[PDB]
Amino acid sequence: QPEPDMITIFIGTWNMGNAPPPKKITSWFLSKGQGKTRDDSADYIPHDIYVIGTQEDPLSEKEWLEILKHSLQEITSVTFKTVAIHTLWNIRIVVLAKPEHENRISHICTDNVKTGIANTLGNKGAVGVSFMFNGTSLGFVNSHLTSGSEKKLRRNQNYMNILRFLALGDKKLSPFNITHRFTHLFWFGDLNYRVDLPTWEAETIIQKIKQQQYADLLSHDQLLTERREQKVFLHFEEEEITFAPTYRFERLTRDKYAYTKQKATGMKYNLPSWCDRVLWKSYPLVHVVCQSYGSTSDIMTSDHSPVFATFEAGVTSQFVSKNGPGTVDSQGQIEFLRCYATLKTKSQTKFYLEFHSSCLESFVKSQEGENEEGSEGELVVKFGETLPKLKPIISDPEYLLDQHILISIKSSDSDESYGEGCIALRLEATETQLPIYTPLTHHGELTGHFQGEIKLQTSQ
Ligand SMILES: CCN1CCC(Nc2ccccc2F)CC1
Ligand SMILES: CCN1CCC(Nc2ccccc2F)CC1
Prior knowledge:
Layout: E1 6-15, H1 26-29, E2 34-36, E3 49-55, H2 61-76, E4 81-88, E5 91-97, E6 105-114, E7 125-133, E8 136-144, H3 152-165, E9 184-190, H4 202-210, H5 215-218, H6 222-228, E10 276-282, E11 288-295, E12 307-314, E13 333-343, E14 351-356, E15 364-365, E16 370-373, E17 379-384, H7 397-400, E18 404-411, E19 417-424, E20 434-442, E21 445-457
Parallel strand pairs: 1-3, 8-9
Antiparallel strand pairs: 1-12, 2-11, 3-5, 4-5, 6-7, 7-8, 9-10, 11-12, 13-17, 13-21, 14-15, 14-18, 16-17, 18-19, 20-21
The structure holds 1-ethyl-N-(2-fluorophenyl)piperidin-4-amine (2 copies).
The site of one 1-ethyl-N-(2-fluorophenyl)piperidin-4-amine (NVY) has 3 residues, from helix 6.
C-alpha cells in the first residue's frame, strides 16, 4: 500500500452554549448548510483526520467521544481511532483518524494555556494537539478568546499568550513558537471577534443577513480589520466567509438573532457576529487548499451555530536511504550566499543564526554577523558568504526539495531569539544561486526580515 502524498482534514468549531447537542449532528461533519459546502457526491468519503473544537462544552470526554464516533460511523461506516482528547474547563479538542493511519501517527502532544490574571483567569484559553503524520508535522489549536465587542485588544493579547506558551511539537525547536513548529497549523475556535457597527444598527444588520449581503458586515468584522492592521494572526490565512454570522441566535430556531442587552449578557449587546472561525498557516510552498468553510443550519441547541472547514493538505513519507537517517549524505549540501537580516530592534548586541530542520542531524549555529546601519534607521546584520554549509541526512531530491529550514537570529549576549522564520527548499533549480526570503517574527510580531541567496545540491 503506497503512503499518501495528500490527506483531507476536517476542522470543526462549536460553542455549545453549555447545552447538550441534539440527537443528529451529521450535517456538521458533512460540511452541509451555509457558505462553501461539500459536494453531495463526497458524503460517503471519510476525511483522513477529524479535529473537533468545542467551547462551553457541558459533556464529559466520554459522552462527547461516544457522540462523535457514532456520528462518523453513521456517515462513513468507519470506526475512527482516538488520536488525542484534551479539555481545559469547558474548552475541548478531539482528534480522530481513520484506523489505517494509526501507525502513520506518532509524537502526539497535548497542551493548554489559561489566559488572563485573577478576574480574567478562570474560563478562557486554548487547548492544542500536535503529532507527526509520516514526515509531516500537524498542529491544531482550539481557543476560546475574551468575549465582548469592546475587548478586541484583549482577544489580540489572548492570541499572543496562547502562541507564546502553548507547548506543542518538537521541544528541540527551542527558539520557535507554535507558529513555526508545524508543516500545517490550524487555529480555530470561538475567537469572539465582533461586527463593530453601532448598536442602533442591529435591525439593519439583521436585514442585511436575511438578504445574504455580508459585504458591508465583513468590512466591520474585527478579526478581518485587526488582521489587516497586522495586530493579530500575522501570516495566517482564512477562507472567504460566505455564511451568515454564527452568533448570537435564539436557541431551538435559526430564524432569530438575540442581540439585545439582558442581565444574562452583563447588559452587553451581542450584534450578529462571526465569532466562530478557522484559520491556518502552512510552511511555504506546501499544498494546502480549503475545500469547505461554512456553518450548519439544522443544529440549534446553542446560541452559536457549528462551523466546519475542510482542507487538502500535502504530506510526505518517512524517508529512509542507505545513508540517512543516522549519518549525512555527502551528495547533499545547502549553501547561503549574500545573506543579511534586517531587524527592527533598537539594541546593539552581536547576532548569530541557528538553522533548524528535520533534514539536519541537529541544529547549526553560525558565526556572528557584521552589524551595519540601515539608511532608514534599521539594524542590518550582514552574514555575506560566512554562513556554514548545511549537511542534510538524505541527498535524494524527492526528499530534500520537500524540506524547510527554520531560522532564528539570536543575541550573542543573551542567546534570546530576536526573530524566527522559515525557508522552503522547493527551489526552481538545484546547483543554482536563487533568491530566498522570509519575514522574521518573535512572539508572532514582525521583528525583521532575512534575505539572501541559496544554492542547493542534491544527488541528481
Ligand atoms: C508506532 C507509533 N505509535 C503508533 C500509535 C500511536 N497512537 C495512535 C495513533 C493514531 C490513533 C490512535 C493512537 F493511539 C502511538 C505511537
Ligand atoms: C501575502 C499574503 N497575504 C496577502 C493578502 C493578505 N490579505 C488579508 C490580510 C488581513 C486581513 C484580510 C486579508 F484579506 C493575507 C495574506
